[PDB]
Paper text:
Serotonin binds to serotonin receptors (5-HT3Rs), a pentameric ligand-gated ion channel (pLGIC), on the vagal afferent nerve in the gut and on the chemoreceptor trigger zone in the brainstem leading to severe nausea and vomiting in patients receiving cancer treatments. Setrons, competitive antagonists of 5-HT3R, are effective in the prevention of chemotherapy-induced nausea and vomiting (CINV), radiation therapy- induced nausea and vomiting (RINV), and postoperative nausea and vomiting (PONV). In the present study, we have solved cryo-EM structures of the full-length 5-HT3AR in complex with palonosetron, ondansetron, and alosetron at the resolution range of 2.9 Å to 3.3 Å. Overall, setrons stabilize 5-HT3AR conformational states that are non-conductive, but appear to lie between the apo and serotonin-bound states.
Iterative classifications and C5 symmetry-imposed refinement produced a final three-dimensional reconstruction at a nominal resolution of 3.3 Å for 5-HT3AR-Palono (with 91,163 particles), 3.0 Å for 5-HT3AR-Ondan (67,333 particles), and 2.9 Å for 5-HT3AR-Alo (42,065 particles). The basic amine of the setron is in a bicyclic ring in granisetron and palonosetron, and a diazole ring in ondansetron and alosetron. During the simulation, the palonosetron’s bicyclic ring displayed fluctuation and positional reorientation. In 5-HT3AR-Palono, the tertiary amine on the ligand’s bicyclic ring makes water-mediated and direct polar contacts with the backbone oxygen of Trp156 or the sidechain of Asn101 depending on the orientation of bicyclic ring. Palonosetron forms an apolar interaction with Arg169 with higher probability compared to the other ligands, potentially due to palonosetron’s pose forming weak interactions with loop C in favor of loop F. In 5-HT3AR-Ondan, the ondansetron molecule forms highly probable edge-to-face stacking interactions with Tyr126 and Tyr207.
Numbering used by the authors:
A (entry chain E), B (entry chain D), C (entry chain C), D (entry chain B), E (entry chain A): 7 to 334, 397 to 462
Amino acid sequence: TTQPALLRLSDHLLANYKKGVRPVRDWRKPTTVSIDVIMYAILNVDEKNQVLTTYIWYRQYWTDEFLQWTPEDFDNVTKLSIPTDSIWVPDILINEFVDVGKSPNIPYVYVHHRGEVQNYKPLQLVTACSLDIYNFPFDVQNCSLTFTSWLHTIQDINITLWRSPEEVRSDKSIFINQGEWELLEVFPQFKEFSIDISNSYAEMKFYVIIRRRPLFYAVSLLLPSIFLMVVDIVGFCLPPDSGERVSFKITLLLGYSVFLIIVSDTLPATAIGTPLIGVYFVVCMALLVISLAETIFIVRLVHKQDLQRPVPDWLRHLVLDRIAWILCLAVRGLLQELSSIRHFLEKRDEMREVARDWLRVGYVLDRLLFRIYLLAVLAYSITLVTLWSIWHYS
Amino acid sequence: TTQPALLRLSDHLLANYKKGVRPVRDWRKPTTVSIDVIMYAILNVDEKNQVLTTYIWYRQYWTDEFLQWTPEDFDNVTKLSIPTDSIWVPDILINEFVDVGKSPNIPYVYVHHRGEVQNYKPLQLVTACSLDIYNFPFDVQNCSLTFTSWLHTIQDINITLWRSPEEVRSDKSIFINQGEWELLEVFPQFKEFSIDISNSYAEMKFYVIIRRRPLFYAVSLLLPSIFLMVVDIVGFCLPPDSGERVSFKITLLLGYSVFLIIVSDTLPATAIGTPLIGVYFVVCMALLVISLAETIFIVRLVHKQDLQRPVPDWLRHLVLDRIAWILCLAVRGLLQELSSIRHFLEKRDEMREVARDWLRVGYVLDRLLFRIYLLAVLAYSITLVTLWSIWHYS
Amino acid sequence: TTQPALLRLSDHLLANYKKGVRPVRDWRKPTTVSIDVIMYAILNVDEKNQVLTTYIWYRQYWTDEFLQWTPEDFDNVTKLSIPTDSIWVPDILINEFVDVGKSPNIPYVYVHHRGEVQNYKPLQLVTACSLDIYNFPFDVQNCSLTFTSWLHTIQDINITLWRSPEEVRSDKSIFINQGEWELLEVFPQFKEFSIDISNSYAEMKFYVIIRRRPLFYAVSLLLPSIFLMVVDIVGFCLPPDSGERVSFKITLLLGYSVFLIIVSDTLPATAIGTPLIGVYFVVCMALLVISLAETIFIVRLVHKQDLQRPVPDWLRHLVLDRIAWILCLAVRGLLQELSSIRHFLEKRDEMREVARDWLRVGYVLDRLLFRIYLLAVLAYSITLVTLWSIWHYS
Amino acid sequence: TTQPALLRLSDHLLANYKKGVRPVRDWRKPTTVSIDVIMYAILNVDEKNQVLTTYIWYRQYWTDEFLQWTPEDFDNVTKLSIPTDSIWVPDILINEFVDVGKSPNIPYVYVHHRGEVQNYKPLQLVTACSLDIYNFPFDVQNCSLTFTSWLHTIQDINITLWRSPEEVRSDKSIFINQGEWELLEVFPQFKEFSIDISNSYAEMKFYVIIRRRPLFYAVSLLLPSIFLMVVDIVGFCLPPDSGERVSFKITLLLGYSVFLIIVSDTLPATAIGTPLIGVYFVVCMALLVISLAETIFIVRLVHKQDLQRPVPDWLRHLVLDRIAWILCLAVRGLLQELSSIRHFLEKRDEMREVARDWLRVGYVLDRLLFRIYLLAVLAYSITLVTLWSIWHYS
Amino acid sequence: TTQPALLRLSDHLLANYKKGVRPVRDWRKPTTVSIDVIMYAILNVDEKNQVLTTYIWYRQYWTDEFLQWTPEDFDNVTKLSIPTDSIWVPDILINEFVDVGKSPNIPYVYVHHRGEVQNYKPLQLVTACSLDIYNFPFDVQNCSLTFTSWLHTIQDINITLWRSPEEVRSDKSIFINQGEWELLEVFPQFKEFSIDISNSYAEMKFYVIIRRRPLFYAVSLLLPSIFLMVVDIVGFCLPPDSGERVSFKITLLLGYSVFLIIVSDTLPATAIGTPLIGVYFVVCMALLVISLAETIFIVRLVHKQDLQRPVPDWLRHLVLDRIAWILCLAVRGLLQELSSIRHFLEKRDEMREVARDWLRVGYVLDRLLFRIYLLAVLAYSITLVTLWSIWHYS
Ligand SMILES: *[C@@H]1O[C@H](CO)[C@@H](O[C@@H]2O[C@H](CO)[C@@H](O)[C@H](O)[C@H]2NC(C)=O)[C@H](O)[C@H]1NC(C)=O
Ligand SMILES: *[C@@H]1O[C@H](CO)[C@@H](O[C@@H]2O[C@H](CO)[C@@H](O)[C@H](O)[C@H]2NC(C)=O)[C@H](O)[C@H]1NC(C)=O
Ligand SMILES: O=C1c2cccc3c2C(CCC3)CN1[C@H]1CN2CCC1CC2
């Protein structure tokens, strides 16, 4: 021989190698591939369509008895690059595909001098995992990735791991943070399933566990919710007989009904169960309609509508009690004329003294309903805080 | 001979095999493929464009007389992997395509030692089926998938089933739940049609039947609909002569007219027939304009506009009836001066006693219209419930 | 010879067949292709960009003198499948392309024993046709599809029809209904054009004619338009001196100005001419500003602003006419005191009797303007109906 | 020889033709391609991203000395079709690419008997040109297309034009009108640039000039702008002491503040300079806040707040001037009682005569501010018209 | 030999060249590629998904010992074009890929007569860099591009630079301005990293630094923010006892609550930290609720609700102080009748003189709260300006 290059090694291997035949001497021994993954980013989690988008890195290796030389007498060449096309490559796919992601192709593989080839490639994957929105800002997710052969049986292609499974779980090395989702754990599991007798299919399940960072939503839905409670505490200080107190409490009720609709499109509500913040917005209405349905009771109670004098059953029940429970011939002709004038004024006087008494009752009930409304907001806001400190601690 | 591998089998088959010729000995015998499907997910059901998106799995098998060896003397090899490119593959397409979905390709097939090849592949499909939105939250759909050869006639390619058709119907095995659509049944049917004499085309129709889960829409359109009825029950308790009762009933009517428009874009209305909830929102207006068009009648009836005394035809018709039907020289010079003063006061007195009487009539009609409005809402809400319990039961 | 298969026919044809050369014996005889189409669906009609999207089916056939055997002595084989790659295939494209639609490829053709090949393929096409929105819900469209060779001249490739043109026009066989567009007619036409001397290019024009179903828009723009006229008929029943009648007529005018903007994005207005419903919304404003600009005239007319007595020119012109046109020392010291008291009351009396008279005039004009406003709506709504019955009939 | 076909010409050329070598005898003579374009449609002009989308047609031709036969003795064949793959094809790209448009491929070229090949192909292109939004409805644009070789130098590939440049400018032949953009001119220009010594690169610049049709925006932003000026001319006719005049002028000011925001997303504002209609909407506010800030001055001026009598400095300045500038023991015991009654009435009389005088001043200023507001709108609307007639003329 | 062309050079090289083998004589010497980039445009910076889109140009060169001739005796040919397919091409990818951009392919390379090939290609890239929105209109970004081999180790492929790194930093030559992002610097850096022992991977990091032009957002969020402060300065000039002052201050508060929501979707808020303009909108509310919560205090203070006389503790504290701190038998029978009349009038007089005194106090507090509100806006607006002049200067 002569010394052209290392390329006469590359002629020695790929002269009679056939691309399609599965590379083994005896047809009973299965080819054993060995995979490994690393999470890189989490592009999109679509709650409505149950579709999760993920870019990962990937590598795998398998042995074969056709690409096998002796390293001596080929000028000590140990490894080698060979293009991906001219090598038998196994088909390993994800069961949970719903679409084909766009990923770069890598046109080279390694080949060691025992037959061990290696294959690095990245791949974007769009899968379909089941999500739960039972507790919306504070939620973990548990989506699956299932690597399997698509055609070959378990006496044909078998799947193990590159590294130990304890080392895969704590591999948070290149993951992109600052991106709405925090990666916790990548847990592998082997499992064999059979859809029929004498047809077994090996598979390998990776479980990813991600947790949403709740900080983005404590300003987008907590801030306008408590803000339309601090207005109604200001709103009760209007005296009820003015006329704008009814017009005040309907404007912001309109103003909050716009808020429930313009947010609900950006907050998803998928299958069984509603998110638990949706209950905590209905209670925001019941402290707002009851605030509306008591000023209707006072305006009806304090008005000038030629009404009767208030009842002494409910005068000493209210006025003299609640200041200590919580709060604190020509002569007779003109005499006929003058007395008729006084009769036209004294019934004008009588109609105003009656209207003072209901108006006196109407302020005592307004201060009394103002306190228990102030205690209903105060006892509700402390229950909201103590369910936030339990989660935040540990 | 020698013993290189099993690959000398792979050289024995694919040495003179021609890819394009249809593989049969006698040209009169038709090649019979045999298909099978399993639903996996339902990605999108677009009501407006009548387009349905679905990811399924798929397998098929056919015989041929060129790939046929004896298993003895090839070291007992029974099955084999061969790349998909070097084999005649029949063209089986869906008639209802409108676009090409993106699906992974599988580069291998099996070949048994009688000639039976097999072919597993997944495929995303976007079809065009006719949808009905006649009853929007409670609806089944009946979309079709039609597998057929695209070119060959029925004496060239014929289609049967892998499994029995009773086993295909009850195959809900890998379907993704928790996803807006519940799969009920996949029903197969064979049918032969001819577009011309001496040109018959076999086909195979799969019917899918899906049912929408109505739970997502009982919070997005039922809750604000009944909520703007519980405000108007509070709204009638304002006394009509105050002035804000007209301003109250127009604000929420504005507030509901925003609601009909911001929802109608997310609820589709396609061909013939409107959805039956659209009728049940027009009746929500007729209990809201009539609630508006009666407070206009009371405010016109109770006002100070130098009006005449109310008519005794309609005084004893109303006031004395409806409390039992439902509800319950210097002397004469000053005498000229004083009597003229009393005349200026007694007509001031007379104009207020007239205005008390209409004001008395105006409250009796307000309580009477409040009851039959309270019975119109009550008799309408029970009809809404009993049409929900009939569907929910069985 | 021996009897391997029919495949020795497939070796007899494709042994020396050259793919690129146009297949004819004498170079002067033109190759004549023959096309045919069937509409399948109409995916999208974008009015703004003048782009129309359509999925059709398609077939064509041509003769050639190289693929020509005798059916005797090849075991009577009449037709044959040959892959699409190894055959000269003519380039027939649409002139109106603006993009490339995604369509499945069909890898087989037929070949008869005279040389006639056939070629079935479906193809999605996005074209650019000119649309008119002159009458928006009731409109036909006339878009063109032009099949032509892209390179070859008319002495090289010539185009005729498969079927008679009378049979193509009435082929509504597989078209998907229930989809916003109704197909009427597919009309073919042959035409030869030359862009230069000695360079003629054959082409074939198909005209499609589609008609929009107007039912979807009689609920999305007719219903809120007439609904904000039935409120203003209720709106005039408020007495004008109350104070909310000005506040009533501005709220719904705000409420309709929101409606004109939130709809106009979903209703297109392209080149020359506005759609004729846009005129019928401006007239909806002129019956709404004039309804606003007359209650401003009454409130200015009926008010307490120390005004003068109304003019007897316009008292007998109005009050006594329009009830028949349409509607129906100590003594003198106290005498100095008492007469000064009466002078302070009689000018209080005089200022109210003046304010009764304008207030009397103000109600007669309000009933008179209420009738001719009720006749202006009534005479306008019957003109709207009779332009709907002319189109609906025939 | 024999007479198989014209195909022995196609064997004579492509037997030893090598695809990759640049086809010239002497390596010093440059290959000269010659291009030409025709605009077809303008799909999208994205102002925000500075990206312009265009579909054009394209053709080019070049000579080579390898594809060259004598037309005699090959049965007089002058031209020929050859597939695009087996020919050296130059790389001509656009410098302004930002993405790859989707365009059909044409698999054939012509070859004449001197060596001149020809090549027709259409191509969608997305470029990046700089746009100016300095005057939004009335604007021309000047975007560039630069055809150049991407690798070869100017002694390797050189670019000229097919036709004369005067004939290219006035080629508006197949352009799709009725589509928001009117094509004016396509102007070619040759230019040679060098990025380094001894490395020159030929290029060819086409300038397109397009003009927006402004008709679509005279109904989407001119009509609601002048419409909320004809309401405020009606709005001043309310008398100021009524109470709704303040509530009237705030509702439509709210109503126009919604309008500025819901439009500004559909009207772009890119780099340096704001569009000149944005100035003409700020002036629409200054005629609307000043209309608001003068009714605040009148309501403060006309009110009952136990105020003092108006000053005679400003009484004869206003009231007596502006009607000609623009507008036009028992006895004494009862005497103690009666005089005290008159004292309680005469100060009630005095407080109303003071309130008549400010109320008299308040109407004269309201008519005076109504005229100069009516002249400020009138003098502004004529300036708006005369800037529209200058552009519309020529 | 003869003289066919230069093409016998192209036959001399590519006769025995093998495409897949890495082209070096001795397998120990690494192949050294050398890259260079130029920014062209910045298409999109998506803050929410942390994805940045960029179109760049790119070139690289490497040596090999197989493509090497002597320029003498081949008619002095120095360089040459060879198609890209038939040459070993190294795999250089970006680590930060999340998708595959669409870019044109260049089918030619140069080859010099020493072995140096060259390769020009453009490529669109979508990467994933970490963004900070800590200060929203005034922000620089620091995103990375990392060119590396994907498979080969550092004794196999090594990466250096074409030009000096000082020349790459100041290369702003073809960058498209007028496009929301200004390019500052492109800084290169070499770094070697090892993921394992005996496996080192060379890489090359380019840092891009871009700065947002803040001019687009000084009209979209600064202008309506200060505009709803100039209305409330007009808003306090209404006298508080009128009745519309409460209705005025709630309409624009509704009007600004719409503004905070319709803008917050177009302004992103990603990971840790809120943008600093979000603090400067909360302070816009605290100058707006406090403006609301003081007119509630005045309306409660000035009202007719049969209240008591104001306290002389707080009369001389306020009224007599703040004008210098800041602001400036028949006889007795009628005597029984007449004195009873005077008693009915003098308590009518007394109830109005009490209501004058609170009304006098209520105006002095309104002018006093008007000044310190005018100083709170003035002292806040100057702090906003001086934080704009520090950034604008240098
Ligand atoms: C659609 O538009 C074309 C416009 O070209 C119509 O074309 C005319 O068709 C008639 C026959 O119906 C020919 O005699 C004319 O010469 C055509 N016009 C031109 C300019 O060539 C076509 O009829 C239209 N479709 C319908 C249904 O009216
Ligand atoms: C579009 O912009 C180009 C800018 O380069 C204009 O270019 C100039 O064109 C004139 C001839 O019309 C040349 O003499 C100048 O040298 C060009 N300028 C430069 C900087 O090279 C072009 O005219 C513009 N189009 C129109 C219609 O005005
Ligand atoms: O893909 C991978 C990859 C995939 C799976 C497991 C592991 C890796 C590593 C590191 C070891 C663990 C590196 N990498 C890439 C990083 N660099 C770019 C391509 C690889 C080599 C260099």
